Scaffold this active site. Structure first.
Site, short mmCIF file in Angstrom:
data_model
loop_
_atom_site.label_atom_id
_atom_site.label_comp_id
_atom_site.label_asym_id
_atom_site.label_seq_id
_atom_site.Cartn_x
_atom_site.Cartn_y
_atom_site.Cartn_z
N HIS A 212 -75.97 34.47 -0.53
CA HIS A 212 -75.21 33.68 -1.48
C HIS A 212 -74.85 34.47 -2.73
CE1 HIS A 212 -79.14 32.27 -2.93
NE2 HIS A 212 -78.54 32.33 -4.12
N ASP B 82 -79.19 33.47 4.91
CA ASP B 82 -79.02 33.71 3.51
C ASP B 82 -79.53 35.13 3.21
OD1 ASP B 82 -78.34 33.53 0.93
OD2 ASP B 82 -79.58 31.71 0.50
N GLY C 222 -81.50 32.71 -11.20
CA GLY C 222 -81.61 34.14 -11.46
C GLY C 222 -82.62 34.78 -10.55
N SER D 183 -82.82 34.06 -7.33
CA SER D 183 -82.19 34.29 -5.98
C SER D 183 -82.25 35.75 -5.52
CB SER D 183 -80.73 33.93 -5.99
OG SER D 183 -80.68 32.55 -5.70
N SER E 255 -84.14 32.07 -1.58
CA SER E 255 -82.84 31.48 -1.42
C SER E 255 -82.63 30.30 -2.39
CB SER E 255 -82.71 30.99 0.01
OG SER E 255 -81.54 30.23 0.17
#
EC number: 3.4.21.81
Lengths: 51, 185
Positions: B33, B63, B139, B141, B156
Site C-alpha cells: 500500500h 500487502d 507511519g 506501515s 499492514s
C-alpha cells in the site's frame, strides 16, 4: 475528504496527515474519518497537513 | 538505514520493513500500500537522500512491495534498529513478536490468529494476514514484525492505537521473499 464510507474496521498505517477541528493531527484519512464517525459527526477538517 | 526506519515517497511516510538481497542486488521490503503508485523513495522529509525506486508492488490482495536501492553509499543494515535478523519464519498462534515503526518505535505482543482477511474498503481487501495484539499507528506501515532474530511480517494496518491498545495485521514476510526471489541477510 468525504467520510461517508465510514466507519471502517481497519485502517492502513501510512502517514499523510490531516488537521482536525480538535486541533489533533490525524495520521491519515482513514483515521480521521473513523474519528468523525466516533464523534457522531461533530469533528470537522480544519486543514490538510499537520495541525 | 534499517528495519523500522522512516521512508518517504512522493505521497507520504511509511517504514522500511527489511533489507533483502538477491545476488549482489539490494532492495528493501515495505508495505504494498505504500509502494502503490510511488516511484522514488527518500530517507528524509526534505527528500534529499535518495534510497531507490519501486521494483514491485502487490496491494490489495497481498500487502507487500519491494524497492531497489539506487543509493550507493547509504548503509543497508540487516537489522531492525539494533536487532540482528538472520532468517525468516512462519508466524504461529501464541508466538511472541515485536514490531518497530517510524512513528511509535518498538512494541511487543503476540500472534493471535492467522489467515485473517482485512477489509480496508473500496475493494481494498487483503487476505491471509497475521493478526496480533500489537499496536501500530500511521507511519508504522511496512515496518518489520519480528521474533528474536527471525523476520516474520510487514505492518499492514489495523485499529486502535498504542495508548489505548489495538490489533494490527501483518503480511507474512515469507510470501514476499518467495515472490521476489530475495532473502534477508
Amino acid at each position: 475528504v468525504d467520510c461517508s464510507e465510514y466507519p471502517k474496521p481497519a485502517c492502513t498505517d501510512e502517514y499523510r496527515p490531516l488537521c482536525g477541528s480538535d486541533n489533533k493531527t490525524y495520521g491519515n484519512k482513514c483515521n480521521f474519518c473513523n474519528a468523525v464517525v466516533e464523534s457522531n459527526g461533530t469533528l470537522t477538517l480544519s486543514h490538510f497537513g499537520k495541525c | 538505514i534499517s528495519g523500522g526506519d522512516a521512508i518517504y515517497s512522493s505521497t507520504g511516510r511509511c517504514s522500511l520493513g527489511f533489507n533483502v538481497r538477491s545476488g549482489s542486488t539490494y532492495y528493501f521490503l515495505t508495505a504494498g500500500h505504500c509502494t502503490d503508485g510511488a516511484t522514488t523513495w527518500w530517507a528524509n522529509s526534505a527528500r534529499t537522500t535518495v534510497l531507490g525506486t519501486t521494483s514491485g508492488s502487490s496491494f490489495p490482495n497481498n500487502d507487500y512491495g519491494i524497492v531497489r536501492y539506487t543509493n550507493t553509499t547509504i548503509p543497508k543494515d540487516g537489522t531492525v534498529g539494533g536487532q540482528d535478523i538472520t532468517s525468516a519464519a512462519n508466524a504461529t498462534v501464541g508466538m511472541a513478536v515485536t514490531r518497530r515503526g517510524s512513528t511509535t518505535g518498538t512494541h511487543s505482543g503476540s500472534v493471535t490468529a492467522l489467515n485473517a482477511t482485512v477489509n480496508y474498503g473500496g475493494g481494498d481487501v487483503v487476505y491471509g494476514m497475521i493478526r496480533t495484539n500489537v499496536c501500530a499507528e500511521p507511519g508504522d506501515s511496512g515496518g518489520p514484525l519480528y521474533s528474536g532474530t527471525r523476520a516474520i511480517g510487514l505492518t499492514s494496518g489495523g485499529s486502535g492505537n498504542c495508548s489505548s491498545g489495538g490489533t494490527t495485521f501483518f503480511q507474512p514476510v515469507t510470501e514476499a521473499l518467495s515472490a521476489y526471489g530475495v532473502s534477508v541477510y
